[PDB]
Ligand binder design. Structure first.
Ligand SMILES: Nc1ncnc2c1ncn2[C@@H]1O[C@H](COP(=O)(O)OP(=O)(O)NP(=O)(O)O)[C@@H](O)[C@H]1O
Length: 524
């Protein structure tokens, strides 16, 4: 049995079901493909005896193409519709023309259709009754989408009496181009609507709460936070890491080459990725001498295991306390218990100095001080605040929890680790788990870099009472990007709301004037 549509899905689909050329603008994750399934089904059922609709669906990316092809065939083939998909994988050895003739829904990469319009294989877009453009914000410049639309519009603004298909675009963002004001952003959006001959921009307006149970992005308030003026722990550990890398790179010339790779600085997620890469290269490594293959790989796995621990401790020192970074290392080296004994005593030779720098009060992490300031402010204003604190890595979770537990100035916090009484839960990225922030009053992104964090809100408390989100970062770059993106999104949303308020004749005339201008340019 078939999925029940969400209400906001019906809401988005409705204008297209009424036959209007529509741009559906809805967030990543809310299931626009399913909305397009609803539109296509309704569309095809419109036709009376004898008549048959014919839908073309354009995919912009190969992986997405394959997925859509599968979704559409799975859903419609069962109902006895002819469904086909074709891309460059097969286009040069089949008759696109006959595939279009034989099918009710065709999933295509667009260049294929462009090629077959240009050689007359498909003499006219009139053969389609509905065209769906995924990622439709791409209908610009000289993209294949725009090239298809040029023909559609030449036909529309010309003297032919042959009908044109309905056009529906899907996108997560109509975008704003280089607009800085609502005036310019509205112009940009009207030009995209002109490009796709759209008369409606459909967004979720009536069923927002239901949407937000599926995908939700809160407003972020960014705050610049201090960071270390020096890191002696990091200098020492970095030296251990260089020694270790020398040892590792020399195991095998062939695998040695992997250490040539640059843009993998100590104490970063890039370094961790590089390590994953090394383990990967090892997994498929082969020599004729199998015992030696085994020796090389065992060696590399040992060395890299250590490097990974070091890299993690560096990150811990970066965002949290040196002592907890050091404990992380001590725990590892104890737990592992001979290259191993050597590496172990190489670490042990630094222990006294490491302990020294870690115990030095002047090595308190100033970033933690700013985190403290934020926490103290918010709990001072609202003592019953519940908080979710996101950090960069799994090891940082334990380090932050320890910091809170040992800090008498944070006596108001009872920390716990997010599972998937406590007033603050600590977590790192773990997709594709959606976090429900309808619980908490405060979300803190603490120097958070990595995979985006998928959030939902299972209920609303009013916008004033919905959870706050702070982005704490030491990067001026990140703060500037956040600010710019916030402006873009504001002007885009206000522009859309305005356009949605417009009289249909006003909108139609505005769009038509744009289309006339663009065609006049192209024709010359
Ligand atoms: N009404 C629904 N009931 C149950 N599952 C749904 C419904 N709508 C969508 N889904 C599922 O949610 C998943 C969405 O995956 P996704 O890659 O995001 O799809 P998409 O529609 O192509 N792109 P997007 O709009 O960004 O979500 C799919 O597995 C859908 O089947």
């Amino acid at each position: 049995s078939p999925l029940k549509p969400r209400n906001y899905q019906l809401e988005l689909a409705l204008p297209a079901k009424k036959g209007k050329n529509t741009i559906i603008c809805a967030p990543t994750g809310c299931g626009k493909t399913f909305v397009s399934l609803l539109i296509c089904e309704h569309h095809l059922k419109k036709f009376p005896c004898g008549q048959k609709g014919k839908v073309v669906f354009f995919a912009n990316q190969i992986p997405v193409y394959e997925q859509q092809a599968t979704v559409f065939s799975r859903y419609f083939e069962r109902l006895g519709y002819n469904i086909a998909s074709i891309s460059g994988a097969t286009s040069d050895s089949v008759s696109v023309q006959h595939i279009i003739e034989d099918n009710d829904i065709i999933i295509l990469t667009p260049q294929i259709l462009v090629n077959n319009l240009n050689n007359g294989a498909i003499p006219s877009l009139s053969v389609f009754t509905l065209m769906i453009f995924d990622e439709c914000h791409n209908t610009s410049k000289n993209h294949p989408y725009n090239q298809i639309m040029f023909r559609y519009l030449d036909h529309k603004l010309g003297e032919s009496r042959d009908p044109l298909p309905q056009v529906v675009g899907l996108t997560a963002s109509v975008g704003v181009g280089d607009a800085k004001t609502a005036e310019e952003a509205m112009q940009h959006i009207c030009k995209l609507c002109a490009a796709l001959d759209a008369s409606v921009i459909a967004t979720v307006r009536d069923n927002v709460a239901e949407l937000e149970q599926v995908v939700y992005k809160p407003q972020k308030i960014s705050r610049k936070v201090a960071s270390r003026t020096s890191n002696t722990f990091k200098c020492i550990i970095s030296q251990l890491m260089k020694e270790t890398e020398k040892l590792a790179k020399d195991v095998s010339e062939e695998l040695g080459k992997l250490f040539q790779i640059q843009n993998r600085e100590f104490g970063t997620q890039k370094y961790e990725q590089w390590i994953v890469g090394v383990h990967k290269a090892c997994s498929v490594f082969q020599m004729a001498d199998k015992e030696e293959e085994s020796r090389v790989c065992k060696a590399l796995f040992l060395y890299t295991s250590h490097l990974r621990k070091y890299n993690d401790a560096l990150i811990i020192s970066e965002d949290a306390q040196m002592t907890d970074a050091l404990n992380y290392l001590k725990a590892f080296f104890h737990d592992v218990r001979e290259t191993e004994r050597e590496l172990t005593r190489r670490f042990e030779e630094k222990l006294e100095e490491l302990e020294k720098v870690s115990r030095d009060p002047s090595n308190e992490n100033p970033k933690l001080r700013d985190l403290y300031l934020v926490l103290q402010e918010e709990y001072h204003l609202k003592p019953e605040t519940k908080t979710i604190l996101f950090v960069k890595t799994r090891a940082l979770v334990d380090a932050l929890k320890k910091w809170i537990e040992e800090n008498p100035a944070l006596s108001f916090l009872k920390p716990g680790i997010l599972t998937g009484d406590n007033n603050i839960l600590i977590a790192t990225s773990v997709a594709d788990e959606g976090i429900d922030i309808a619980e908490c009053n405060l979300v803190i992104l603490y120097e958070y870099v990595g995979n985006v964090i998928k959030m939902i809100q299972t209920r609303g408390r009013g916008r004033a009472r919905d959870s706050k989100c702070f982005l704490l970062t030491s990067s001026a770059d990140v703060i500037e990007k956040e600010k710019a993106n916030m402006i873009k999104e504001k002007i885009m949303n206000e522009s859309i709301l305005r356009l949605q308020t417009w009289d249909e004749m006003k909108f139609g005339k505005t769009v038509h004037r744009i289309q006339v201008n663009e065609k006049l340019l192209r024709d010359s």
